[PDB]
Amino acid sequence: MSLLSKTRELNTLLQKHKGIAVDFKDVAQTISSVTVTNVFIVSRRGKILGSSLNELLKSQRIIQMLEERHIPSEYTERLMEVKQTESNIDIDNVLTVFPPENRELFIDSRTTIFPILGGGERLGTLVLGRVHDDFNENDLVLGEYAATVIGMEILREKHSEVEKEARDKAAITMAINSLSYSEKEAIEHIFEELGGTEGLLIASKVADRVGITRSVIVNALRKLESAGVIESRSLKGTFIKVKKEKFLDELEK
Amino acid sequence: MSLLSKTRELNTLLQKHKGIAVDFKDVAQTISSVTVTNVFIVSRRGKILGSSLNELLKSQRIIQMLEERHIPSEYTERLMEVKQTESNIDIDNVLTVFPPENRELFIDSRTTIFPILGGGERLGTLVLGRVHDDFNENDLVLGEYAATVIGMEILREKHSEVEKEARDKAAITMAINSLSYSEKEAIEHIFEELGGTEGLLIASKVADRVGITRSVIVNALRKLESAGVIESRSKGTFIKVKKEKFLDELEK
Ligand SMILES: Nc1nc2c(ncn2[C@@H]2O[C@H](COP(=O)(O)OP(=O)(O)OP(=O)(O)O)[C@@H](O)[C@H]2O)c(=O)[nH]1
Ligand SMILES: Nc1nc2c(ncn2[C@@H]2O[C@H](COP(=O)(O)OP(=O)(O)OP(=O)(O)O)[C@@H](O)[C@H]2O)c(=O)[nH]1
Ligand SMILES: CC[C@H](C)[C@H](N)C(=O)O
Ligand SMILES: CC[C@H](C)[C@H](N)C(=O)O
Numbered sequence: 001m002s003l004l005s006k007t008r009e010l011n012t013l014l015q016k017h018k019g020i021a022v023d024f025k026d027v028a029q030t031i032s033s034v035t036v037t038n039v040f041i042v043s044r045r046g047k048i049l050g051s052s053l054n055e056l057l058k059s060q061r062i063i064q065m066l067e068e069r070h071i072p073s074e075y076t077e078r079l080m081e082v083k084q085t086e087s088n089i090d091i092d093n094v095l096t097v098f099p100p101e102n103r104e105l106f107i108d109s110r111t112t113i114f115p116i117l118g119g120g121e122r123l124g125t126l127v128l129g130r131v132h133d134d135f136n137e138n139d140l141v142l143g144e145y146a147a148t149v150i151g152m153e154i155l156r157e158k159h160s161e162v163e164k165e166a167r168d169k170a171a172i173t174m175a176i177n178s179l180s181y182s183e184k185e186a187i188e189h190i191f192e193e194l195g196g197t198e199g200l201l202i203a204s205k206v207a208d209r210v211g212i213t214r215s216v217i218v219n220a221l222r223k224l225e226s227a228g229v230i231e232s233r234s235l236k237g238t239f240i241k242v243k244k245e246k247f248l249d250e251l252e253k
Numbered sequence: 254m255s256l257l258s259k260t261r262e263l264n265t266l267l268q269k270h271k272g273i274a275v276d277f278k279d280v281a282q283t284i285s286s287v288t289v290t291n292v293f294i295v296s297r298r299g300k301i302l303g304s305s306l307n308e309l310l311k312s313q314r315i316i317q318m319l320e321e322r323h324i325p326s327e328y329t330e331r332l333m334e335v336k337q338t339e340s341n342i343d344i345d346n347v348l349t350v351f352p353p354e355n356r357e358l359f360i361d362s363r364t365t366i367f368p369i370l371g372g373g374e375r376l377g378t379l380v381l382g383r384v385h386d387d388f389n390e391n392d393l394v395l396g397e398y399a400a401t402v403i404g405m406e407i408l409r410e411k412h413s414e415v416e417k418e419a420r421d422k423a424a425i426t427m428a429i430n431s432l433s434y435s436e437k438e439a440i441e442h443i444f445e446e447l448g449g450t451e452g453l454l455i456a457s458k459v460a461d462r463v464g465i466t467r468s469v470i471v472n473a474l475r476k477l478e479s480a481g482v483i484e485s486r487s488k489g490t491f492i493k494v495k496k497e498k499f500l501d502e503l504e505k
Contacts (some may be wrong), residue, residue, distance in 0.1 A: 003391045004397075011401045015370040064351050117268040137257050144257075145398055150262040152275075152402065156409055159273045167420075177377075178427045226426045228419070 003138045006034035010142070016151060024050035031146050037128040037141055040097065041150060043117050044124055046076030056130050059099045079113060079125045085144060087135045097129035108132050114143045118151030126150060168244050175227035176251055179213040182253060183220035186212060190221070191248060197240035256391040259287040263399060277303030283397050286396035288392055290381040291350065295404060296378055298436045299329030307386050312352050332366060332378040338397060340365040340388045350382040361385050367396045371404030379403060425499045436473035439465045441503065448498060452492045
């Protein structure tokens with residue numbers, strides 16, 4: 001299989017996945033496919049963001065890592081001292097991705113470590129392990145590109161998290177300020193007489209219980225929908241749901 | 254210079270660049286450097302998002318494209334018809350990135366076209382041109398890496414633009430529904446009359462209508478202005494719309 005074919009298999013995933021975000025679980029599968037490796041994609045603190053494992057599944061310690069969704073803290077710290085691609089690491093080296101207590105299985109194994117960088121900083125690590133053959137230039141071309149793309153994706157996720165929490169705050173503030181005082185009260189009555197932050201609403205039944213007009217209730221919900229703090233499909237009954245769960249607390253302030 | 258070394262140039266750019274967005278002029282320059290090519294990165298409609306040219310800078314036709322920030326419509330359409338990487342296109346093929354009126358100068362030229370896909374959609378095209386040497390599979394690995402990351406970046410930007418347009422739409426609707434009944438009728442008569450985007454308002458005239466007063470007009474106008482929908486100043490009062498997708502919307 002040509003390097004060009006291997007890169008195309010990875011790029012096809014990157015170009016055609018659904019949603020805005022690449023799923024690193026998928027990336028791990030594809031990297032494993034084109035390099036015939038055991039693959040970990042881990043965060044800075046060792047959370048397993050994706051894995052694609054074969055021979056490593058034999059090891060009971062590895063099985064436990066998958067359950068905990070974390071590599072050991074010791075290995076985590078070791079990876080963070082690797083600041084350059086280091087390849088063809090053997091089983092008696094502490095950077096090996098194989099369990100030393102299963103040395104006999106992995107006597108000829110090779111590990112390569114690819115730091116994941118973005119925004120000029122270390123965002124995680126991509127680790128590849130083979131039971132037999134050495135890694136070559138093709139493997140490093142694939143791995144370093146993959147690590148770069150994973151870094152881009154983490155950087156995007158991190159920025160979009162920061163942006164979203166800033167823009168949520170503003171949207172909630174705009175929403176709240178667009179309600180009349182009566183409407184603020186109606187919303188309080190609506191979510192009190194709902195099982196929390198969402199559920200099925202019968203406006204008439206709530207209006208009659210708290211002694212207000214359905215019109216005010218309908219108006220307030222319409223305002224919140226257009227503001228985008230709640231979703232609500234209008235089928236007897238109306239399901240409503242708060243998107244920004246910082247809303248109700250802010251509303252009472 | 255190994256292929257690994259060449260791919261590291263792009264990797265380093267992506268890992269180290271400042272700001273959230275990757276700059277496509279930077280990408281074009283980096284690709285140009287490692288493959289010794291003339292490089293265009295263009296949108297679906299042929300807008301030049303980034304370029305790095307050498308020999309093609311000598312063509313007055315190309316210069317005009319750069320000034321216009323667009324490749325020609327005809328070439329744009331031809332690029333969109335290319336659905337997968339097509340390499341080593343010669344000077345007599347309409348897909349050449351070279352000016353065919355300079356056929357002798359570019360007689361041995363080679364062009365490779367890299368569709369840019371992201372989010373399962375065609376988002377643009379990466380085009381490389383060499384005056385002499387054939388493209389090989391290492392060149393294609395480099396071009397297809399660059400095309401994929403450009404695609405990821407366009408996808409990110411388009412998603413931001415969708416969210417911005419949502420926020421803009423919400424701002425207008427919230428402004429409208431901040432208006433009381435009388436305030437809305439005042440505004441509706443004010444802009445219907447305003448003749449369009451500009452005009453001076455004599456509020457007294459609108460205030461002749463039953464249910465509308467001068468203070469109602471002031472209140473209605475201030476809500477819209479606070480929202481950033483309009484600007485105002487005092488004879489009478491001069492009104493300037495700043496989001497005429499508010500004139501539209503005010504009617505529904
Ligand atoms: N695009 C994408 N990003 C992911 C995926 N999984 C995790 N992330 C991002 O990767 C980063 C690290 O993941 P976290 O869940 O925060 O794990 P963590 O151990 O707290 O990360 P650190 O702060 O680096 O220690 C975060 O920015 C996540 O949003 C994924 O499948 N796809
Ligand atoms: N990250 C990044 N995005 C860019 C850059 N230049 C343009 N874009 C984005 O690329 C996309 C296409 O550019 P446009 O300005 O929309 O050009 P257009 O011809 O109207 O685009 P089409 O919708 O394809 O017709 C937009 O999402 C831009 O925001 C760049 O240098 N870096
Ligand atoms: C993924 C962790 C690996 C197995 C490491 N060599 C350890 O023994 O902990
Ligand atoms: C960039 C466009 C190129 C030169 C195309 N072959 C043309 O003649 O228009």
